[PDB]
Amino acid sequence: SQLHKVAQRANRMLNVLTEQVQLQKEFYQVYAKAALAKLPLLTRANVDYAVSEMEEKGYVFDKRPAGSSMKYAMSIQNIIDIYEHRGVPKYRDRYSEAYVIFISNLKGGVSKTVSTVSLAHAMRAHPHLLMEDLRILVIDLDPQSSATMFLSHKHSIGIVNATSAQAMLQNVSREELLEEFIVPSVVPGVDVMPASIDDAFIASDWRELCNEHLPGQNIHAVLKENVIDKLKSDYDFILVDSGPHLDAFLKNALASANILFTPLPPATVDFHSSLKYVARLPELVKLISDEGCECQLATNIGFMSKLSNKADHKYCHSLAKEVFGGDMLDVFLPRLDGFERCGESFDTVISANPATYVGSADALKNARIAAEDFAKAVFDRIEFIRSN
Amino acid sequence: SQLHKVAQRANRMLNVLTEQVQLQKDELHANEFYQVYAKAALAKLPLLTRANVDYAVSEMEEKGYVFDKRPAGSSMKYAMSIQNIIDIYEHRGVPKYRDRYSEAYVIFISNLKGGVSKTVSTVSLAHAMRAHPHLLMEDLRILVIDLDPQSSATMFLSHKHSIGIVNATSAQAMLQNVSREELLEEFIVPSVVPGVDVMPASIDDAFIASDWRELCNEHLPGQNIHAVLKENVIDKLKSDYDFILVDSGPHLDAFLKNALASANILFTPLPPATVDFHSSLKYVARLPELVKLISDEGCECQLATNIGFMSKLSNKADHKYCHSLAKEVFGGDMLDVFLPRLDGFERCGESFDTVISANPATYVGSADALKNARIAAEDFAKAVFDRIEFIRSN
Ligand SMILES: Nc1ncnc2c1ncn2[C@@H]1O[C@H](COP(=O)(O)OP(=O)(O)O)[C@@H](O)[C@H]1O
Ligand SMILES: Nc1ncnc2c1ncn2[C@@H]1O[C@H](COP(=O)(O)OP(=O)(O)O)[C@@H](O)[C@H]1O
Ligand SMILES: [Mg+2]
Ligand SMILES: [Mg+2]
């Protein structure tokens, strides 16, 4: 009974530490008016007419003095509103229901979380996708909660309780999900439904917890029916992140996705493992199907992750190209220091402010551009699939 | 069905890759471990003197013992392997650990919070304990059972061109329920440091964990689902090892439960990061509940205590706060030593080497980094060993 003893001491500690984070409780990117001209469909002249015409109508743009005078400090919203003023339709004007993206791989360390949060921020803030005025939701279903930490400033969530796995069991309305479970991330337009280590116990007793709280409901269609379907009209993209564990969460995530992206690692051994997952994927969809709901899983796109020039890497890259063939993204996430440094302070290569960044400013830009290139390639891929 | 297409091509590629690594399967030769001592260096070890070593060495050669000398100098030099030193201690009559205890002792370093250093501690503990200068006379035999589909332990313990893929895994051994002779011949693999072995894991074990109930029903009818590891694997190796370490992933599944039911003692690595620490505490506060669950539904846990230790601790002030909190929680069950965050552990982890198996000459970094990592690892291992000794004899 020495555990009971220590376990209690740790309990008083939690209740104490929990009242810490509670008692505790921004996007740097701004564009100079002239900078908008490099954005698609916009020119120096038409931005001047838009800003001019909108102002005369009562619009007020963000500004900040650079010495004495006061220039324009355009926020993403200002830009989005300028495009709207110029009759450029938004993504929601051609697609009516949210598309669910699931970056998955049973093998860990392959960059599932980083590629997921990077894709969320980079798609929203992509210079070429701002006109799309995208609304993105990242649903964290990994008790390790890496996505949560990356997306909402660690001093925010700290000890989370309103969890995605909780949402699944509580089965609440759209309004409650937006108001009580979903929290904003640093980049406006990108939200997150958090996770917490406590979700490990939920996954562990999923079977029973379902019989108690969701009687008669197919245990594999919960995330899809109790959460995603209720939010389909408030978001353009919904990204689900789960751990590399063949859980109820992994299954619920698979049953709700429209598309899968498999991040492929460069080392031969990890690449080998990943192919095992890609090979048994149809087996997994078959199971979930044979016992409940059907997976609307269209395709499975692969892409190299943390790739480099090592001979071994080039080799795997050739093999992956062989396996996925056409469904192989033409862009990949290379291994960069920017992603590591950022990963250490749980910040996105998009939200990380260069003025605060500890490391070379060059390295940061490189990863940002890499995240952006990756996001644009993903978005374009969905586009082709969705309008064909 | 443009998902079954890739699966097909993927499956084919596996065959190719498999047969490829199936050739480069180098044979891990024992006399390849870098560590060697000049005859004179043994004198610095406990119980050994320059004179009792020369006497021992002389008598052994008289009985035909063959020292693997090197052709250097007018008369060959003794390039002593940790095994030579072990054989010398044996010849002087100092008792080995297996002379001091009669059954393997099962250690389980665990935490539901991942990234806390469960694998690196487990792996460093094994190697550092075997090769620790003050523990050579113990002639330890250590087995690391990898039950994490990620197989990080398997990777640190062998060579990338030594184990490659993994077919006969621990999860597989649990369900097949084979003989001790079979576990020894087919399922256990040696690591880079002789004396420490590993029962491997593979990604395919994630499917086994996923369908544990159905698989136990079809392969192990009547057997309690939480006692499979204890009865089908560990109990059959009780005489073959002094220590058996179990490594599992951060999941509250069958593997985690079986490891617990087989453990003699538990070690909990506690991270300094306020968020990580808080998560670790939630795990410590639910341990009794978990043990109670296993009990209520079948077998009992012989879990003695739960020792806690700071993992990846820095000189930062923040860290010193958690350390205190941790002390309040664990109190006496806190380890006197902690695992500090060091470059040696990082650079080594990058190449899946242990700060014990990593040859300093080859280390691409600062010798001091590697040297400090090894020492820290050795002090941690001696501390765990000394603590087990006090618990075991008392
Ligand atoms: N492209 C990259 N370059 C450098 N480091 C990366 C990259 N992608 C991921 N990482 C780092 O690799 C580790 C694994 O990524 P993570 O997203 O947590 O994987 P999974 O989601 O596979 O667990 C993290 O510590 C992260 O900072
Ligand atoms: N003392 C340490 N100093 C520096 N890096 C460490 C230390 N202990 C562990 N690590 C590194 O931290 C990461 C997490 O450790 P790992 O043993 O894999 O954790 P778990 O077993 O938590 O997955 C690894 O990348 C590892 O190389
Ligand atoms: Mg993840
Ligand atoms: Mg581990």
- Integer CA distances (angstroms), A222 to A64, A192, A374, B5, B121, in order: 48, 18, 31, 29, 38
Q: Residue B246: which of B392, B106, B391 has the closest Cα?
A: B106
Token pair, residue A301, equals: 């796109």
Atom of ligand 2 nearest to the CA of B122: 17
Instruction: Select from B6, B14, B281 the Cβ nearest to the Cβ of A276.
Output: B14
Element (H, E) at B218: helix B212-219
3-state secondary structure of A300: strand
User: Is the distance from the beta carbon of residue A344 to the nearest atom of ligand 1 less than 6 Å?
Assistant: no
- Of B44, B121, B139, the C-alpha closest to B337 is B121
Residue (of B64, B116, B141, B56) closest to B90 by Cα position: B56
Alpha-carbon distance of B163 to B289, in angstroms, equals: 38
Burial readout A207-220 (b: 16 or more C-beta within 10 A, e: otherwise): eebbeeebeeeebb
Question: Could you tell me how far CA A120 lies from the centroid of its own chain?
Answer: 4
**Coil, strand or helix: which one is A322?**
helix
Contact B42, B79 (CB under 8 A): no
Distance CA A28, CA A121 (A): 13
Could you tell me which CATH class the domain A27-96 is placed in? mainly alpha
Q: For residues B292 and B301, give the distance between their C-alpha atoms in angstroms, rounded to a whole number.
A: 9
Tell me the sheet residues that pair with A238.
Answer: A100, A137
The neighbouring-strand residues paired with B269 are B309
Dist CA B57 CA A98 (whole Å): 77
The CATH class of B33-102 is mainly alpha
**DSSP calls for A134-189:** --EEEEEE-TT-HHHHHHS-HHHHSS--S-HHHHHHH---HHHIIIII-EE-SSTT
Nearest to A344 by CA among A330, A364, A369: A364
d(CA B158, CA B357): 10
In the CATH scheme, what is the code of domain B103-394? 3.40.50.300
Pairing of strands A70-72, A63-65: antiparallel
Whole-angstrom Cα distance, residue B172 to residue B162?
A: 20
Rg value, chain A, Cα: 22
Confirm or reject: Cβ of B341 under 6 Å from ligand 2: yes
Query: How far does the centroid of ligand 4 lie from the alpha carbon of residue B119, in Å?
Result: 4
* B150, B248 Cβ separation under 8 angstroms: no
DSSP symbol at A214: S
Q: Identify which of A108, A203, A191, A105 has the alpha carbon closest to the alpha carbon of residue A148.
A: A191
User: What amino acid occupies position A118?
Assistant: S
Contacts of B205 (CB under 8 A, 6+ apart): B147, B149, B169, B170, B171, B172, B255
3-class DSSP state of B188: coil
**CB contact (8 A) between residue B114 and residue A144:** yes
Beta strands in A149-297 (DSSP E): 183-184, 190-193, 237-242, 259-264
Would you call A245 and B21 a contact, using CB atoms and an 8 Å cutoff?
no
- Choose among A144, A244, A300: nearest Cβ to B150: A244
* Length of chain B in terms of residues written: 394
CATH superfamily of domain region A97-388: P-loop containing nucleotide triphosphate hydrolases (3.40.50.300)
Indicate yes or no: CB of B333 within 8 angstroms of CB of A6: yes
Q: Is the dihedral angle over the CA atoms A268, A272, A273, A278 positive or is it negative?
A: positive
Q: How was this structure determined?
A: X-ray
- Number of other CB atoms surrounding residue B137 within 10 Å: 20
A285/B3 CB distance under 8 A: yes
- The residue whose C-alpha atom lies closest to atom 15 belonging to ligand 1 is A111
Minimal CA–CA distance to A130: which of A39, A38, A44?
A39
Q: Which helix (H) or strand (E) holds B325?
A: helix B317-330
Q: How far is A283 from chain B (nearest CA, A)?
A: 9
Structural domain boundaries in chain A: 27-96, 97-388
Total residues belonging to chain A: 388
Give how far Cα A213 sits from Cα of A59, A166, A167, A202, A217, Å.
49, 11, 11, 12, 9
Please name the helix (run of DSSP H) or strand (run of DSSP E) that holds residue B245, with its range, or none. Answer: strand B243-247
| Disruptive mutation site among B1, B147, B167, B203 for chain A (greatest number of A CBs within 10 Å) | B203
